[PDB]
Design a binder for this molecule. Structure first.
Ligand SMILES: COc1ccccc1NC(=S)NCCN(C)C
Ligand SMILES: COc1ccccc1NC(=S)NCCN(C)C
Lengths: 536, 534
């Protein structure tokens, strides 16, 4: 109002905003960062569902990222880029429910399809402000309207005493839902089309996307979904009400909080850091790829277990894109499996492999664990250290990601959904993790968001072209529900995943290759046999 | 009279017969008695040595076949009839046969002793596929084969009783082995170089002689073709043998052990055979009612226990399998399988078939088998399901037991050689979907393709000669490799480390590693736990 462009001044339901003009390699983009979408969930509102942001007066400055939700900070490899890139990059606070919007500059004069990013982090970490989630490239190159929101993690987002009024659980997912409702009402002010909203997320964010697919009140808030290396089904994304209650009760005892009302009231008096300092002490077994406070089967947000909901759900008018990276498990081994480190080749003995299986499959009986060991052992070389190391990675990746994804894709396809499946096989030339980890969990994200287009990041030219291809796949799917370009038949086609043919594509520097069966043989072990075994 | 055909053994004089092989004559001494006829009160009893005889005993023709069930699945079909008795049935059946080079061997010659198979309920040494003609003529071997009692007559047991102690059919084999030690030198054979070889139940028999101390002094090397003493069909516990014997007695109207066996001895042979199959505890295939029993005597413990703790240092063993061990048995009980159609089966038929092929499996173990063998890219393809049904039966009953035995023998001192036989005879009468069925390597080991009237291909003739050389080289030296040939390539010993075996087909030897390693880990390591826990 005076000297402000004014292509950066926008009004939303809550009031006026002032965004910022950012520089992307190919031109400018508009960014509206740190938009509050909820009342600060602090004090008496800790553990409570979010309340919509009450209107503010004057022009709110939306030129910088807001606080990151309070969370545990990783210190396994202090100062190491491979881990620090995921750590908070803004102040930790319980006052953290803000979202961000990237659009073309000038804003589009025509309703534009919207992408909503939901970050992962095992439901205990993450932030929409991380560099790998920078929406400026998708906004500039593909003309997308990209939105990303913070949501409460850890105890603050998922500590639950099911049935209580003061800690009903799943409030972190309700934070996400409120952001989705904010987009429905307000994204038109930015040139976005609320009738074309695609959710995409990775790890716990993909599991979050799946929970919105499975929760009725969320289905009216989006039209398509992308689940990258994560699912609502599987062994880590949810807990039962009984397990959530015992974990919340134990944590309370561990911070000096011995009726649900009095217990939660006492928890609300504790400092945020006190809860973070003990949240990892409530897991029932020594484990990797397990997180203390995750979505709970409350019979409300989730009317039943994700397994039961995907086994019996109707997904006719639903298009979904799902996939995995080549080495889903390797990242998690250095966080608790003896013998595994980023600083050596991590060749392990057979004994270390058996011990690792008990940690990677913590819920397994002795017989189930033995079944795993026999299945993954190479009986031509049962003691080879290199194969055992790679087998340990496959156990963790198959159990937690690949086979849950394969299960989800199969059920969704059988029950009306249009599914596209991929495996991501390119290892970034810039990767700082060792070679034995291969293509680890989470390292497709930087290519989807188009970071290789930033010339200062020293990616290769082939990786730049590769990123543009993936951006086109993702935005084409967002636009049409089909990753294939409407008129580019020269390039090979990406067929839908079906129960009959089970076709998926490999994403690497070569053109698309069609393959059949997402670890079909191995995932029969995890998804068909092992349930029968454990229940006996 | 021909003096090459006159032989004096400890019992008396024998007269053999000059037979014609493709390349020249051989001396055949057929139907030599090695035991007193196990008839009347000697039914179910251990064998006794044959009493001496006067004059010259005629040994020019095969003797009777031990009384046994006769197959009627495909009447008149060559594929089944080639295994049926080709001489009259009789309980008076304990005779053996000797083939030698004509003239007699000038120096002591290694001896090959054949033990026929047939599920311990059938078989005979007089079958055309066991013709010692060619091995004697071409390789100069002294070949011996004996009849042993089968079915109830050979293995009905009331363990602990005096009148039916069990395993008498194996004692028949052992007595023939003793006869060879005592007499084979009169034929030019070397009793200090005796090699046992057998197929199916015959191979299991060979293995039990390895695991029974009194037998170990009677041979020096062993070949086990598509059979093992360990595994789910070759032995039964004392309690199960007692159950099956008592049930058969009930079915034939009988009636303490003495009184029971006394009434069984009054029954005509066919009465017992008529109810032989009615005592199995489950509907099944590749299961036989009366087999060797873990008596604590002939077998001091289970074959599994004995191979796990035995000392096999100075032992050489040759083992192997055919490409499609299970196909033969499917047409004998599994719905959806016939020699006359391609036997394309549904998935439901596959689950039903698995309960018959793994009769002892719980519902959960059966599910484990189904899920392991299903191709989850084509879970309902009938061709794959049919071939998977054959693989289940073959792996469960032969391939993995063999891999188990080979590993334990190698680990505990034995020199082991392993093979897979992958050639389908041009003359085979079974359908193509059966592949290389159980038992159809034998005609090549014995050298039948060297007979031009049988219309084998000239490549199969050359192939047979190769196999006869492997087997006789192993008999001579404990090593199947030709000590004159140079890297064709070499047949390496099987070891727990490298797990090397060779493919036997029309192409030169190809060394491979791991005998269905992943699948036999399932059968040999996991499934016992799954059942040892229910
Ligand atoms: C954003 O998420 C990821 C990104 C890259 C690799 C792993 C994860 N996933 C988790 S949970 N990272 C936190 C550390 N934990 C393994 C203990
Ligand atoms: C001599 O042995 C064989 C030779 C060829 C194929 C199978 C067998 N084995 C058995 S047991 N044949 C009897 C019939 N059985 C299917 C019940």
């Amino acid at each position: 109002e005076g000297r402000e462009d004014p292509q950066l001044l926008v009004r939303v339901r809550g009031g006026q905003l002032r965004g910022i003009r950012l520089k992307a390699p190919g031109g400018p983009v508009s960014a509206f960062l740190g938009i509050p979408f909820a009342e600060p969930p602090v004090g008496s509102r800790r553990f409570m569902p979010p309340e919509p942001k009450r209107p503010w007066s004057g022009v709110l400055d939306a030129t910088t990222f807001q606080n990151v939700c309070y969370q545990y900070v990783d210190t396994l490899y202090p100062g190491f880029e491979g881990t620090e890139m995921w750590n908070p990059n803004r102040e930790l606070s319980e006052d953290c429910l803000y979202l961000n919007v990237w659009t073309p500059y000038p804003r589009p004069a025509s309703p534009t399809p919207v992408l909503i990013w939901i970050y992962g982090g095992g439901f205990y970490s993450g932030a929409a402000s991380l560099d790998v989630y920078d929406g400026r490239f998708l906004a500039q190159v593909e003309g997308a309207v990209l939105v990303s929101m913070n949501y409460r993690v850890g105890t603050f987002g998922f500590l639950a005493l099911p049935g209580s009024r003061e800690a009903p659980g799943n409030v972190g997912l309700l934070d996400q839902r409120l952001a989705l409702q904010w987009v429905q009402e307000n994204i038109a002010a930015f040139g976005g089309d609320p009738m074309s909203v695609t959710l995409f997320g990775e790890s716990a964010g993909a599991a979050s996307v799946g929970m919105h697919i499975l929760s009725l009140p969320s289905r009216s808030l989006f039209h398509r979904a992308v689940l990258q290396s994560g699912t609502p089904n599987g062994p880590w994304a949810t807990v039962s009400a009984g397990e959530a209650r015992r974990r919340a009760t134990l944590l309370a005892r561990l911070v000096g909080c011995p009726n649900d009302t009095e217990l939660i009231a006492c928890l609300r008096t504790r400092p945020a850091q006190d809860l973070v300092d003990h949240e990892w002490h409530v897991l029932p077994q020594e484990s990797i790829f397990r997180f203390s406070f995750v979505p709970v089967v409350d019979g409300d947000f989730l009317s039943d277990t994700p397994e039961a909901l995907i086994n019996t759900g109707d997904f006719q008018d639903l298009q979904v894109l799902v996939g995995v990276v080549k080495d889903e498990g390797s990242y998690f081994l250095v966080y608790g499996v003896p013998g595994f480190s980023k600083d050596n080749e991590s060749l392990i003995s057979r004994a270390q492999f058996l011990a690792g299986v008990r940690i990677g499959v913590p819920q397994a009986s002795d017989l189930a664990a033995e079944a795993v060991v026999l299945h993954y052992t190479d009986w031509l070389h049962p003691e080879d250290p290199t194969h055992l190391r790679d087998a340990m990675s496959a156990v963790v990746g198959d159990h937690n990601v690949v086979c849950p994804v394969a299960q989800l894709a199969g059920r969704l396809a059988a029950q009306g959904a249009r599914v596209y499946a991929y495996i991501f096989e390119h290892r970034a030339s810039t990767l700082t993790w060792p070679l034995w980890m291969g293509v680890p969990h989470g390292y497709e994200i930087e290519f989807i968001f188009g970071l290789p287009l930033d010339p200062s990041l020293n990616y290769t030219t082939e990786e730049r072209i590769f990123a543009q291809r993936l951006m086109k796949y993702w935005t084409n799917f967002a636009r049409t529900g089909d990753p294939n370009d409407p008129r580019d038949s020269k390039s090979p086609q990406w067929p839908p995943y079906t129960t009959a043919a089970q076709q998926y594509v490999s994403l690497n520097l070569k053109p698309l290759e069609v393959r059949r069966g997402l670890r079909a043989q191995t995932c029969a072990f995890w998804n068909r046999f092992l349930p029968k075994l454990l229940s006996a």
